[PDB]
């Protein structure tokens, strides 16, 4: 009988991969052919994005169920590890089955297969529940101390077959880290896959000048740079926030899920923004899309912190309470990105023809603002203390 930490970490890694699987078709999409084949390509792109969002939400629901199930189960043994492996294996099929269902809604086979997958997940979780309750010493201390465990043995089974409830903070952190890491390095995978200069390619087009062939692919490298920087800074904000949380609630979990779902779209936004169009109006539209995606990504982290503030008296560390030693700094740190993204958006309307340059300048502004945030907060508070 051993601690279950590592098996839950492995399960969280698997769940991150499975949830974010369906992003690959979106980034691997036929991005931009000239002469505006959009009138027919945009239906495909929108279908792919919708499938991505739906699959991510479904897998997140499955992950939440898993987190609760192994919250009631405290310890692990050789049998529970294998049962959890079976549960993970059956979970891994949800994206493909959902995509098949949406692809062929009229044929009942897809819906039947999705139902089969859900039933399998439920059955395996029920087996885990039964195994745990058949051996009392595996349950969490609270459950096996209680005398009503008999009712819980059926209650949890009924669940597996509200906003104030706790989630596992550790598993929220693990899943969020997995998703952030997958997204940040998303479009370096394809660069490695297909962007190394072919010897014949350089020989014919670039007459053997490898430097010319390399520079021909600058835009995708720049897009990767921007995407990684933005996603890393969003993760930094998330990490700073969650270093100060005592307990995580279901509302915070839902807001985190929304934040991650919207974070997932940044690689596409940057790929498109560096996929230069024929005329600059499309470029302004691309910048607007990037700004709105970033705002949507970060506003939900800010919303999560504000929601936790409603019960700070129990939910947060004292250092972040109202009037705390770092409350102002935390608010500024979480509000930075939404402000910059919103201003970059508004610039497209107010100072349109300079907005692309303003977006580029904002990309450089935000990281430095994060780096000096404590110093700038101190300076601003010192200035405003006597006003």
């Amino acid at each position: 009988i051993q601690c279950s930490q590592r098996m839950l970490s492995f399960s969280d890694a698997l769940l991150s991969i499975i949830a974010t699987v369906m992003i690959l078709p979106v980034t691997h999409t036929e991005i931009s052919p000239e002469q505006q084949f959009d009138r027919s390509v945009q239906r495909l792109l929108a279908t792919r994005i919708a499938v991505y969002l739906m699959t991510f939400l479904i897998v997140t629901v499955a992950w939440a169920a898993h987190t609760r199930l192994f919250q009631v189960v405290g310890k692990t043994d050789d049998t529970l590890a294998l049962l959890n492996l079976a549960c993970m294996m059956t979970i891994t099929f949800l994206p493909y089955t959902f995509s098949l269902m949406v692809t062929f809604p009229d044929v009942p086979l897809g819906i039947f297969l999705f139902c089969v997958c859900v039933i399998a997940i439920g059955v395996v979780q029920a087996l885990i529940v039964g195994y745990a309750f058949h051996f009392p010493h595996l349950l969490s201390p609270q459950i096996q101390r209680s005398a009503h465990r008999a009712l819980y043995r059926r209650h949890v089974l009924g669940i597996v077959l509200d906003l104030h409830e706790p989630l596992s903070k550790e598993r929220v952190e693990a899943f969020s880290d997995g998703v952030y890491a997958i997204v940040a390095t998303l479009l370096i995978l394809d660069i490695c896959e297909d962007n190394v200069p072919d010897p014949k390619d350089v020989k014919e087009r670039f007459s053997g000048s490898l430097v010319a062939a390399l520079s021909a692919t600058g835009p995708r490298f720049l897009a990767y740079f921007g995407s990684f920087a933005t996603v890393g800074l969003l993760w930094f904000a998330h990490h700073s926030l969650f270093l100060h949380v005592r307990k995580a609630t279901r509302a915070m979990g839902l807001l985190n899920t929304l934040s991650l779902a919207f974070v997932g779209g940044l690689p596409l936004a940057y790929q498109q923004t560096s996929a230069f169009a024929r005329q600059p109006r499309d470029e302004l539209e691309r910048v607007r899309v990037s700004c709105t995606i970033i705002f949507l990504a970060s506003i939900f982290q800010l919303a999560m912190w504000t929601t936790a503030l409603l019960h700070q008296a129990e939910t947060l560390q004292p250092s972040v309470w109202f009037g705390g030693r770092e409350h102002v700094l935390m608010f500024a740190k979480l509000a930075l990105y939404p402000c910059a993204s919103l201003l970059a958006f508004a610039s497209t309307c107010l100072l349109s023809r300079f907005s692309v340059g303003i977006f580029h300048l904002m990309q450089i502004a935000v990281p430095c603002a994060f780096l000096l945030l404590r110093l700038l907060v101190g300076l601003a508070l010192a200035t405003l203390r006597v006003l």
Binding site: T292, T306, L309, L310, F345
Partner: peptide, 28 residues
């Protein structure tokens, strides 16, 4: 066109965040 409308939706989102923060402050 829509850009200003979607910007207004963004403004509404930040406004609900602000109202949540102010409610928390008032509760203290």
């Amino acid at each position: 066109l829509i850009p200003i409308a979607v910007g207004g939706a963004l403004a509404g989102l930040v406004l609900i965040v602000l109202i949540a923060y102010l409610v928390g402050r008032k509760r203290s």
